[PDB]
Design a protein around this ligand. Structure first.
Ligand code: MG
Ligand code: MG
Ligand code: MG
Ligand code: MG
Ligand code: MG
Ligand code: MG
Ligand code: MG
Ligand code: MG
Ligand code: MG
Ligand code: MG
Ligand code: MG
Ligand code: MG
Ligand code: MG
Ligand code: MG
Ligand code: MG
Ligand code: MG
Ligand code: MG
Ligand code: MG
Ligand code: MG
Ligand code: MG
Ligand code: MG
Ligand code: MG
Ligand code: MG
Ligand code: MG
Ligand code: MG
Ligand code: MG
Ligand code: MG
Ligand code: MG
Ligand code: MG
Ligand code: MG
Ligand code: MG
Ligand code: MG
Ligand code: MG
Ligand code: MG
Ligand code: MG
Ligand code: MG
Ligand code: MG
Ligand code: MG
Ligand code: MG
Ligand code: MG
Ligand code: MG
Ligand code: MG
Ligand code: MG
Ligand code: MG
Ligand code: MG
Ligand code: MG
Ligand code: MG
Ligand code: MG
Ligand code: MG
Ligand code: MG
Ligand code: MG
Ligand code: MG
Ligand code: MG
Ligand code: MG
Ligand code: MG
Ligand code: MG
Ligand code: MG
Ligand code: MG
Ligand code: MG
Ligand code: MG
Ligand code: MG
Ligand code: MG
Ligand code: MG
Lengths: 131, 88, 61
RNA sequence: UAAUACGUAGGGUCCGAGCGUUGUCCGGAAUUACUGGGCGUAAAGAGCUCGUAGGUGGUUUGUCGCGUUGUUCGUGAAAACUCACAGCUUAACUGUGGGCGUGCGGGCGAUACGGGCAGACUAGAGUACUGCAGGGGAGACUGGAAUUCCUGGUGUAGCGGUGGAAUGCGCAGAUAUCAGGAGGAACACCGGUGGCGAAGGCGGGUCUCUGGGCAGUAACUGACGCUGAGGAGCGAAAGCGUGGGGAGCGAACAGGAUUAGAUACCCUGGUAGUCCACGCCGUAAACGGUGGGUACUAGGUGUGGGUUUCCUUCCUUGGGAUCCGUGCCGUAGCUA
RNA sequence: GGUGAUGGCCUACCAAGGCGACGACGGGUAGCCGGCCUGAGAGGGUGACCGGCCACACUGGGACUGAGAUACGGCCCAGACUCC
């Protein structure tokens, strides 16, 4: 049972990075689209896209790798999952790699990066710790 | 099992129209007729645990479909229950 | 252990293997000697030590 | 018997107006693993299923925002901790008002995700159209070879047995061997690292009723999904009840033998059971020592199942593609 | 009917229910808390003093006084203890 689309998408991304893929195909969703917004604007995924398939709209992810073959994303771990969900206050926003990482936070405006949320003073739910 | 002639007949007089087959009502009708015939047979053949497993599987399927129907629309659910004689 | 199991059962901490049962949590007990004798330690170390059997205020032998 | 570990000495070490012992409690103890554990064998996946409650959800179209954060004033006693200042000659102490005070209240303004509410769609799931292979399951029917036994011939001194021998059965005619008859259990070859079954496990055929799994058309329902505490059903063999059956095999039990000793290994036999019918009991190293389900991730070598399509002889493990199950070896990773 | 104040606080009659596996009722433990010790932390332990509340006054009960009684050195009764 696909009981966590976000987790499955992140697992697919990290697995594709490990297997040295170029394109990852997933069913398309609004949450997937906006999360791709976040990651692409941060510069972790070279570029996304949404297409049309036999049944439902999907998406393909284009990654990058460091100039010396370097992996673009090192580790991917979900934080707030079905059952165990995690939130944060305006002051206790999570710190990843001492700021070297990006944590996806759901705030009133939408999903914004950790720095955006910290500067805006807004908070919400942290989605994934990307490094 | 139910063969072509009466399976078509049951689809015909129990479906919304004469084309649809995958309706929950068609599902329940087929399941009920099969279970009645099969319980008639099992009252003769006693220790066929292998097929009473399918018994329980079909019963679970019936109950799951009935839960779905009662959750979605109660009027049709109760009408079907009454017109087929099921206790629940 | 899944979160629902944790909620269902609660996490139990170790039950302390309390030593020195005689003082029952006291740093001291006073007693009266009943006998004086000697005993032989286990196989690795052999000797003739002096041990005393004492009656305690907590009535433990 | 020649101690840096006992005691004495010196010398040295830590500490100090206190120094040790003991005892309670936290820590390292991530040694109850939320942060932040593991389950193959080191301790652990139950024996396997359906499935109630609970826990959880495959999509987008829509509002209320009760899960949520959003800010404003509005509570949070003093005392204690943290910052700074202030003085007791510095000294503990307090002279000092700020600052601290991790939770709770309503009013003002948000909707991204996270529930219920709401109508619609289908990539899960499910049925529907036609095919498929199969030791799947239950009842009944039936054939064969063989053991054993009864009867009857031919037929002669042994037959059988183990490392050897006697218990054993024979001169009342053994063994063998041939005719006939009886009857119970089980089906070699097919038959394999193969089928199916959720799991135990299941195969000589025939018929009867019937379950499960898979392929193409994708017609239809449309968030029905997943798994499951308790509960309940299934569940090898051994064992028990009742009544049948009881060839072979064979615990226990007798004898023969080896052995110092054999209440065993071996031999002669041989009762439970082994089979039928219905009830029971529910444990196995019930193992793949790995719970179930979904998604993703280089290959190589085979089986079986079903599909298509082309060299096209269109014969053909000729070639391509597809999906299901099934053996072994292997990268990256993981792992003691 | 009763209370300074609603209410099974007490009484009568009606109905059979209420509490229960998001742990009732049962058993052992023990004053709660701001706090004290520990730990980077979450957390664990714990309730010295001070302080905010609670309950107790030889053991069991009850009531008077009033704005105010669990009435510690206020009252009555019963048991124990000591004494005249
Ligand atoms: Mg969605
Ligand atoms: Mg987690
Ligand atoms: Mg069939
Ligand atoms: Mg010496
Ligand atoms: Mg010494
Ligand atoms: Mg010294
Ligand atoms: Mg300690
Ligand atoms: Mg652990
Ligand atoms: Mg082990
Ligand atoms: Mg286990
Ligand atoms: Mg068991
Ligand atoms: Mg608001
Ligand atoms: Mg406010
Ligand atoms: Mg306030
Ligand atoms: Mg103050
Ligand atoms: Mg401090
Ligand atoms: Mg000063
Ligand atoms: Mg201050
Ligand atoms: Mg704290
Ligand atoms: Mg729901
Ligand atoms: Mg439509
Ligand atoms: Mg479907
Ligand atoms: Mg077949
Ligand atoms: Mg049967
Ligand atoms: Mg004869
Ligand atoms: Mg013969
Ligand atoms: Mg359609
Ligand atoms: Mg379940
Ligand atoms: Mg359920
Ligand atoms: Mg259970
Ligand atoms: Mg349960
Ligand atoms: Mg049962
Ligand atoms: Mg039962
Ligand atoms: Mg058996
Ligand atoms: Mg048996
Ligand atoms: Mg017996
Ligand atoms: Mg029996
Ligand atoms: Mg019998
Ligand atoms: Mg017989
Ligand atoms: Mg024997
Ligand atoms: Mg013997
Ligand atoms: Mg025998
Ligand atoms: Mg067991
Ligand atoms: Mg087995
Ligand atoms: Mg299992
Ligand atoms: Mg799984
Ligand atoms: Mg390999
Ligand atoms: Mg590697
Ligand atoms: Mg009134
Ligand atoms: Mg009342
Ligand atoms: Mg009344
Ligand atoms: Mg108390
Ligand atoms: Mg505190
Ligand atoms: Mg800590
Ligand atoms: Mg802690
Ligand atoms: Mg406390
Ligand atoms: Mg005070
Ligand atoms: Mg106090
Ligand atoms: Mg008060
Ligand atoms: Mg009292
Ligand atoms: Mg009083
Ligand atoms: Mg007093
Ligand atoms: Mg007095």
């Amino acid at each position: 049972t696909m009981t966590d689309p976000i987790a499955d998408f992140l697992t697919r991304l990290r697995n594709a990075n490990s297997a040295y893929h170029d394109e990852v195909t997933l069913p398309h969703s609004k949450l997937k689209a906006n999360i791709a917004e976040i990651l692409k604007r941060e510069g972790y995924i070279s570029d996304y896209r949404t297409e049309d398939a036999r049944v439902g709209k999907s998406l393909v992810v284009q990654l990058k790798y460091g100039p010396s073959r370097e992996r673009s994303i090192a580790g991917l771990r979900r934080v707030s999952k079905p059952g165990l969900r995690v939130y944060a206050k305006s002051t206790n926003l999570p710190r990843v790699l001492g700021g070297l990482g990006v944590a996806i936070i759901s705030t009133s405006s939408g999903l914004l990066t950790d720095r955006q949320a910290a500067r805006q003073g807004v908070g919400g739910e942290v989605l994934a710790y990307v490094w | 099992a139910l063969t072509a002639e009466q399976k078509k007949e049951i689809l015909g007089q129990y479906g919304l129209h004469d084309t649809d087959t995958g309706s929950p009502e068609a599902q329940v009708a087929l399941l009920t007729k099969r279970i009645q015939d099969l319980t008639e047979h099992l009252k003769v053949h006693k220790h066929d645990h292998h097929s009473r497993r399918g018994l329980l599987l079909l019963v679970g399927r019936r109950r799951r479909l009935l839960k779905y129907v009662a959750q979605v629309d109660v009027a049709r659910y109760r009408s079907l229950i009454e017109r087929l004689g099921l206790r629940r | 252990p899944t979160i629902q199991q944790l909620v269902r059962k609660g996490r139990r901490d170790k039950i302390a293997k309390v030593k020195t049962a005689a003082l029952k949590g006291s740093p001291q007990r006073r007693g009266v000697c009943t006998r004086v004798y000697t005993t032989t330690p286990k196989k690795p170390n052999s000797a003739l030590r002096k041990v005393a059997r004492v009656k305690l205020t907590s009535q433990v032998e």
